[model samples]
Target: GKETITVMGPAEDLDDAQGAWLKTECEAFAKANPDFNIEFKYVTSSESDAKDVVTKDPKAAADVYMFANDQLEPLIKANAIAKLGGDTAEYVKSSNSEAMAATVTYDGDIYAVPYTSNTWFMYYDKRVFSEDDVKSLDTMLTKGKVSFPFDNGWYLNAFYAANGCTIFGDGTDKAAGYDFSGDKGTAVTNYIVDLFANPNFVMDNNEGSLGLAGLKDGSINAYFNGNWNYDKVKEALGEENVGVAALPTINIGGKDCQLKAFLGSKAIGVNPNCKNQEVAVKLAAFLGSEDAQLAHFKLRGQAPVNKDLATNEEVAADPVAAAMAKVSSDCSVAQPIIDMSGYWDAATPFGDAFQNGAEGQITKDNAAQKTEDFNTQLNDSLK
Candidate 1:
């Protein structure tokens, strides 16, 4: 008389300790609730890509799944995730930090459970840049080489945000629009245009991954990226040499601007199509519980968003965890969960000017005008 439930997760989980722990927990849940059975399905469906798979066929998607914060809006629009209630809502609010909880909320209803903050922070080489040196991007450039993903919208937005740009008004309002134009936009664009001319600036891209490799060889001393790259950074610069911190301050036209990362979360969601909503909700909660998050941290090195577990002795000692927590707390903005297809399309074209051969779009003479046009098109794309 048992109802069967399917769970979907990333490919590596099936072969790793995370998978082992998941199965163990499922077994426990099944034993406790005699009328339920938990089944596992692994896909290449990473948190970021889960939307594509889930929305493609919600009924066919797993009863419970993992997804990123920004993907939540679309998942809701797709009616792919269930609106969590009762004990589930209490558990999410009680265990997670407010910011972490916000990632899974839409309007006012909580929809999912967050496991980790999906945001970037800065990493530096302790030997090359002093503690104070890494605090300012301009100061660091003068002292040591620094790498930045100048062409990437995710990394690039730090500048605009630092200088007073708003995206989706606190990031939940799709209708509030983006504010990357006018004086603030012009100033940041000009600053970025100048960065390309700096002898110490290295463009970080997947084509060469200038920054990731730069850290290893000691050729690049500082950069902004996140925890997923922690292993590689440790490999490049030994654990002792690697230093991590929240975003650094940058000087724009003599005004100090604190670089702010776009904050989001990696979370778990239950499908609305679940034949057994009760069991699906329980499994979703269990996947993001304090003990479960702790297990994932130990097994997958996922940074914790659960306040109590984050302060736990072992987790607190990790520099990556410390820095990630700082970014989520003091210096980050929401990564808009609204359909940001227009945002990406608008933001990704900056490479055309500063990237390489073009070098023609954002000149001091034209930066202001270009920014005006960009803001127009940025908003227009959404319309």
Candidate 2:
């Protein structure tokens, strides 16, 4: 009997040449296994919907699935997937680094093989940034001089780290095993909430208006954003003119911290429920290899999840890829794969304080009080 493998993923997000590369790879897999045929589907839906498509029913619909880093937790929590242990596990572990596996792990299990690592970075106009402005940007914001996108929980890690805050604390304050849960979160997020109390800063989600727009009109001094935006920023300001720097360093757990963005991967996984688990897992493993990732990186500009591909000359020779590498190298931070459904939602209070209080609308003392209140609310929601 002929066997068919059904694979599903987000098309709008992944519908670039990367999509074509994957399809081509699958075709080659089918050829390698004469009795097996591969079926591909780019499900154009919201992330939640895309996740459900595979999690809800793996047997009838899909043999394999691909999802964003944050989405991997729910499946692992539900025990809705299979393990890639043994030979499948060893191959993947050897191919990638610990940093690369940051978001694909649960408890101790490896759920998926990474395809790309994503993180945020600041974009600036080389022509506009000045010694005075750089100093001004920092001095003003810390003393209530600047406001930025401070709502997202992960957004502030770079700043807090740069300012000497550790989202994950040192061993003394909390046990070394402390993660983003339990009493641990309190220590990790306290500084972020407190920063919202600053009055001189102004929080702007759309850096375009505050930073990018300022650069355009020569009004604003600098901007903050993810590494993915590098291409567009480079297009506007010549590469030579642009300066990509690691986030400023700060003290955390009594030590200097550096600005770090989310470190995680976008990857492919096999659905254990699928009838074609054998072929699906084999194909997925193949995709995670250096050869397949390099070909895909050429077609798609995203950073290759494979450590081998990240250092490959053939892959890094391209200007866009090199730019992404520069950004990735500087900004990558450890991201945990766990059910943060509550933690992410509870972070709303921190956002409110940053935009309304941290920007100087409220007194510094009042902002501090608000931060205390936010901490209480976040802890409540986590439970």
Candidate 3:
């Protein structure tokens, strides 16, 4: 008497290897537990988008599904994911790094098992930028041409955070409100205005496409993006010519400041509507196990969130994963898993001002007043 549990995860354009390995593990798990069967469904949407799909029809969704930690708030609010108890809970507590584990937790309740960590680090063309030049973002921007996504709010937030700006009060108390109109905000605005004026610095809306092509043709040196673009980078420049490192320090207000990235994770959650809750929980736990994570790393180069596997000699030796690990260690902040719909709506105009290069935009001299006005407008728009 076998009961089948369907699981949906990223595949095809995302990582075919991970999807393939998932099927293999499911078969093995099924053999070990003859009374159960594992069925895998490939979801083309990313973890974030997958949340939308799951939210649309929770009961119709897979028994187990993979999603980004930042989407935990809405899913938990909707009771789309089942809370963990017993061995599944213990395995998450013991096997994952504290930060990784925290991503799937909300209000002290664990809801998912983390498998892959997601964060941005610097990927460079070694042939264009010297090792020393890659350490300082200011130097890299001055010495060689680089493309940065200045139009997107997600990417743009790094500069504001680096310059000591706070968003929505520590990114948790959504009711605490946002404050992007203060002195710190002005400092970031002024710095970016000057940065955009740099001849060597190109403000790219597209993440690293033009820059990567430039890397291949010997026109550009380095760019800032995440693992999603890693394959293309490796293809453009030979693996030997590519290098990965923590993001370079930027000169903000005449002082060196470390650029911070938002740390995120891909985790598996059990559907609350599943008929076989016990089997669903076990499958979720098994997918995030050390052996499974290691297989994913070997097959797709996805960084593992399992603490022991992440630090294993072979995994640690991987340039990209190692560099991402270093960034996550000290220089990154976890992406807030709270509802941010209002924040996104408010920030759109602010981002558009920079993208359009509109006149009367924030300037070095009037950044303070300009930012204040922008915040006022943003608040009004939200209402």
Which lDDT tens digits does candidate 3 get at residues 182-251?
Answer: 8777877887777777777766554457767776776666767776567777888889999888877788
- Please list all clashing residue pairs in model 1, or write none if there are none: none
lDDT of 2: 0.56
Report every candidate's CA lDDT: 0.80, 0.56, 0.75
Q: Which ten residues in a row have the lowest lDDT in candidate 1?
A: 12-21
Give candidate 3's whole-model lDDT: 0.75
Error of 2 at 258 (Å): 3.1
> Looking at candidate 3, what is the lDDT of residue 147?
70
Model 3 regions lying over 4 Å from their true place: 1-4, 12-19, 206-214, 217-220, 345-349, 356-370, 373-383
What shift in Å separates residue 199 of candidate 2 from its native position after superposition?
11
- Kindly report the root-mean-square deviation of model 1 from the true structure over all alpha carbons: 2.7
- Over 1-383, each residue of candidate 2 has an lDDT whose tens digit, in order, gives 45556666555334553356666666666767776655555444433344566566545545666666677766765555677876667766777777666566666777777776655655555565543343334432443233356656656545544443343253122222223432233433454444554444445563344555444444433456544455555655566766554344434355444556665567777777766667777877777666677666655445576776756776667554554455567655566554445545645445554454245333333444554554455445545
Q: For residues 277-375, write the lDDT of model 1, one tens digit per residue.
A: 888898888888887778777776777788888668989998889898788777788777777766666666764576545746678888898888878
Predicted model with the maximum lDDT:
1
Provide the TM-score for each candidate, comma-separated.
0.90, 0.71, 0.88
